[PDB]
Each structure stands twice: as structure tokens, then as C-alpha cells.
Design a protein around this ligand. Structure first.
Ligand SMILES: [Zn+2]
Length: 324
């Protein structure tokens, strides 16, 4: 959903557009600050409307058009045609801006910042709105602090999850460095209240590997998460012993969705988590665990609303972090 028209948008309609642009350019590696600094500008140029002609003068290609009011409009519209993109279109316009960053276009460095620098900046959305104004837009009237106020407003009004321990109970049958099969590892075997006991997604995640032989699924958090130890990081983990395996590679789960059950794939759940967003298969040291940097389960996942029955004397922590 985007609002595209030759008419001034209300704040409700702009908010929808502003959210869309945030989502799109976020995936393209721009910072929330720089996107909002641009939004403050596009609010003044266009009410964040990709279909808007300057002064509502439809079809006048000598005047401004679209989100940043490309002037003359034909420079953009012609670029769009050459690129096989429909010109009056949100994504096409965002693709034009990305192109300008990638091709040393539009921007003039008047504030000791290049366009490539701009999109990675974490200066205030106010600061960056004014940098954008001076460098990209270059208006005849430079005194427009409202673009800054608008930037900071979109920063606050648009758009971390706390990693929650998957299961309702903690009851450890074999901890980190356990003698039977965890020597050298930070793995933990957990049992449920019964056989085949459910556990849930600690955060939005995706299934990245399936080992049918060894009965494991591997998962990677979609975003960086907030950990029980106050760390912010991507995480990757493995669930072993479920039978049959619930999902396939690519499967997407939201925080709290059913992720698996204990099993015999004695009934239990072997769990192991590493730092980062890269699954790297396995190693033995001397016992089997994930390759990569193992993290303590009790430092990563919070135990809010978990019944601890055993325990193993680990620093299990609750967290007051509130999910975005
Ligand atoms: Zn184990």
C-alpha cells in the first residue's frame, strides 16, 4: 500500500508512505536517521507523494515531480523510461534515489559529507535533514528548519525484540560441558513437563538448515535482537531431537510461534546458540556443537514467566526490555 496521486497528502496518508520508504531503504542499508532526514525534506517538497506534480501542474515536465520534486521532472521520468520502470511509482522513485547515491549524482558536498556518507550517518535526524537540504535540494530559500522538525517527528513516530527463552520450564538433564556428550560445548539438554513438550520462537527467525540425519533444524534471527545480558546482536541456534522435523529450510516464524517439541529424534531438547547471522555447520571439541562463537543460553535468552525447576545454578535472568 502506497498513496500515489497529484494531490497533497494528509498526515495519515504521509505516515503510510513514510513507513513504506523506511522499510524499503532500511533493507537497502540506509540508517533510520538519514531516511528520516530525507523524509523531513520530502514532506516539505511533496507531502511524501510520489505522484505529485509541482503546484499540482500535471504533465508539466519542466517543473518538479514526485517525492523530492525532481526538477525538471523529465530528468527522472527519462531515467525511469531508460530503466524500464513506470515513472509514477513509489519504488521507481526510491530506485532513482539509490541510483543517485550509487552514481555520484544530484548531491553536492557543501556540508563535508558525501551522499554515500549521508546514508550511513547516525547524526540526529534534525542535523541530517539540514545537510540533505543544503546538499541535495539546494533551495533558493535555505531557511527551512521545519524540515528538521519533521525529520525528528518521523524518527519518533515510525517503526528490538527481546530474545525470549523458548520453553515454559527450565529443567536441565545435561548442562554446558556435561560429561556424557557436551564436553567443550555450551549446549544444554532440556526436558519438558512431559514427553514431546512444545517450545516457541524466541524472536522473528528463519529456518536456515535442516539435518535429517541428526534430527536438527537451524534458525537465524531475522534482525538483531536484545539479549538477556543487555547485548544487541544477531543470533543463530540449533534445535535437536524433534521427530519428525516440523519445518523446512526457509520457514519463517514470528516471535512466540511454535518452533518445535522435545523428542527422541530419553525425550528432550538439545539447544545450542552462537553469535551472528551465519550458520557454519558443526564441530567436535571433543563433543559435538555448532561451529562459530557459542554463547551462553542464559545470557542470550530471558526467562520472564519461566518456571525454573533445574536450574544447574546458571545466571538465568529476566529482562524488562519492551519489544518494538
Ligand atoms: Zn545435548
Amino acid at each position: 500500500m502506497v498513496y500515489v496521486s497529484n494531490k497533497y497528502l494528509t498526515m495519515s496518508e504521509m505516515k503510510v508512505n513514510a513507513q513504506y520508504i523506511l522499510n524499503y531503504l532500511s533493507s537497502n542499508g540506509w540508517t533510520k536517521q538519514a531516511i528520516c532526514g530525507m523524509l523531513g525534506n520530502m514532506q516539505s517538497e511533496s507531502t511524501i507523494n510520489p505522484g505529485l506534480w509541482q503546484n499540482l501542474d500535471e504533465g508539466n515536465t519542466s517543473l518538479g515531480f514526485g517525492l523530492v520534486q525532481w526538477t525538471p521532472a523529465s530528468n527522472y521520468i527519462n531515467w525511469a523510461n531508460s530503466q524500464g520502470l513506470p515513472y509514477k511509482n513509489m519504488d521507481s522513485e526510491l530506485k532513482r534515489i539509490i541510483w543517485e547515491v550509487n552514481n555520484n549524482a544530484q548531491w553536492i558536498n557543501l556540508r563535508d559529507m558525501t551522499f554515500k556518507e549521508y546514508i550511513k550517518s547516525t547524526k540526529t535526524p534534525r542535523e541530517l535533514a539540514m545537510i540533505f537540504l543544503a546538499s541535495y535540494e539546494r533551495p533558493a530559500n535555505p531557511n527551512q528548519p521545519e524540515r528538521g522538525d519533521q525529520a525528528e517527528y518521523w524518527y519518533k513516530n515510525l517503526s528490538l525484540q527481546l530474545a525470549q527463552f523458548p520453553m515454559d520450564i527450565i529443567n536441565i538433564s545435561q548442562g554446558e560441558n556435561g560429561s556424557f556428550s557436551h564436553k567443550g560445548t555450551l549446549c544444554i539438554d532440556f526436558v519438558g513437563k512431559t514427553e514431546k513438550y512444545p517450545y516457541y520462537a524466541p524472536c522473528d527467525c528463519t529456518c536456515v538448515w535442516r539435518g535429517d540425519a541428526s534430527a536438527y533444524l537451524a534458525w537465524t534471527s531475522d534482525k538483531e535482537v536484545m539479549c538477556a545480558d543487555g547485548s544487541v546482536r544477531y543470533i543463530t541456534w540449533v534445535n535437536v531431537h524433534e521427530s519428525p522435523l516440523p519445518f523446512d529450510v526457509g520457514k519463517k516464524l514470528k516471535k512466540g510461534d511454535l518452533m518445535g517439541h522435545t523428542g527422541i529424534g530419553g525425550d528432550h531438547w538439545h539447544f545450542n546458540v552462537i553469535d551472528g547471522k551465519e550458520y557454519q555447520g558443526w564441530t567436535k571439541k571433543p563433543d559435538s556443537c555448532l561451529a562459530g562463537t557459542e554463547l551462553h543460553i542464559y545470557d542470550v535468552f530471558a526467562v520472564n514467566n519461566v518456571e525454573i525447576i533445574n536450574g544447574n545454578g546458571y545466571d538465568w535472568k529476566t529482562s524488562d526490555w519492551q519489544d518494538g
